Amino acid sequence: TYPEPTPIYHITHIDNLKGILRMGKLLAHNQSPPKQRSIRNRAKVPQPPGGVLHDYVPFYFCPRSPMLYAIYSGATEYQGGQEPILHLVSSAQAVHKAGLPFVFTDRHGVLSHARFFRQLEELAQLDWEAIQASYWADPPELREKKQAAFLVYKAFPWALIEEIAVYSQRVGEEVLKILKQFPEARRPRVCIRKDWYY
Ligand SMILES: NC(=O)c1ccc[n+]([C@@H]2O[C@H](COP(=O)([O-])OP(=O)(O)OC[C@H]3O[C@@H](n4cnc5c(N)ncnc54)[C@H](O)[C@@H]3O)[C@@H](O)[C@H]2O)c1
Numbered sequence: 001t002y003p004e005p006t007p008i009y010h011i012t013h014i015d016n017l018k019g020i021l022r023m024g025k026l027l028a029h030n031q032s033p034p035k036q037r038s039i040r041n042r043a044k045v046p047q048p049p050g051g052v053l054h055d056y057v058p059f060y061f062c063p064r065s066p067m068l069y070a071i072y073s074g075a076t077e078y079q080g081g082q083e084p085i086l087h088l089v090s091s092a093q094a095v096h097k098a099g100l101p102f103v104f105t106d107r108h109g110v111l112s113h114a115r116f117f118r119q120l121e122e123l124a125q126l127d128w129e130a131i132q133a134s135y136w137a138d139p140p141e142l143r144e145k146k147q148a149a150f151l152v153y154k155a156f157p158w159a160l161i162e163e164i165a166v167y168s169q170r171v172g173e174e175v176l177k178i179l180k181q182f183p184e185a186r187r188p189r190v191c192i193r194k195d196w197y198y
Pocket residue numbers: 009010011012013016017018019020021023025026027028029033034035036037038039040053054056057058059060067110149
């Protein structure tokens with residue numbers, strides 16, 4: 001079995017929010033998103049619609065990801081830390097109800113041994129205890145499975161985002177200031193969630 005609804009999470013720097021609201025969508029790497037801050041070109045997707053991982057907008061099935069810990073620890077090229085990083089929240093069911101092409105994996109999608117699925121019933125193939133683990137570093141099988149991904153082909157409409165989660169009051173205020181510049185954009189919930197950060 002699997003959680004229903006099935007939340008999906010995309011992390012991005014706050015400096016990218018204006019470009020997302022202006023476009024009305026997240027764009028996949030290969031669709032040239034007007035990103036301001038960076039925080040897969042040969043990793044083939046074997047389910048339709050195919051292409052490579054950079055053809056999809058990527059989500060995890062958990063907040064507080066290993067990627068976020070690399071950002072927190074200054075391991076990434078980006079050196080601004082976790083506090084300006086938003087979690088944009090949707091659900092796998094909303095994507096499927098919208099008829100958007102998607103695939104998802106049972107583990108880190110860059111792994112040659114990742115399995116890919118295209119039907120929400122196959123969410124049962126994922127390791128939900130690994131996805132939800134707070135102590136995820138070891139063993140390797142667990143860490144790989146924590147990074148199961150939900151991939152939406154080409155573009156992801158802003159209207160499907162139900163919540164922007166933030167680290168702090170100050171970041172929440174900055175998000176509300178940006179949303180107010182786009183009065184016709186859907187206004188999701190804005191929530192401070194320290195338990196989603198390190
Ligand atoms: N970001 C995540 O939550 C996430 C989820 C699962 C997997 N991953 C893995 O991490 C890698 C790096 O992730 P990434 O987030 O750099 O990946 P990405 O390939 O999605 O990079 C695109 C960047 O542009 C931003 N962006 C998209 N549309 C935009 C728009 N209209 N205006 C401005 N900015 C826009 C995205 O938020 C992101 O920061 C991925 O290639 C994947 O292997 C990331």
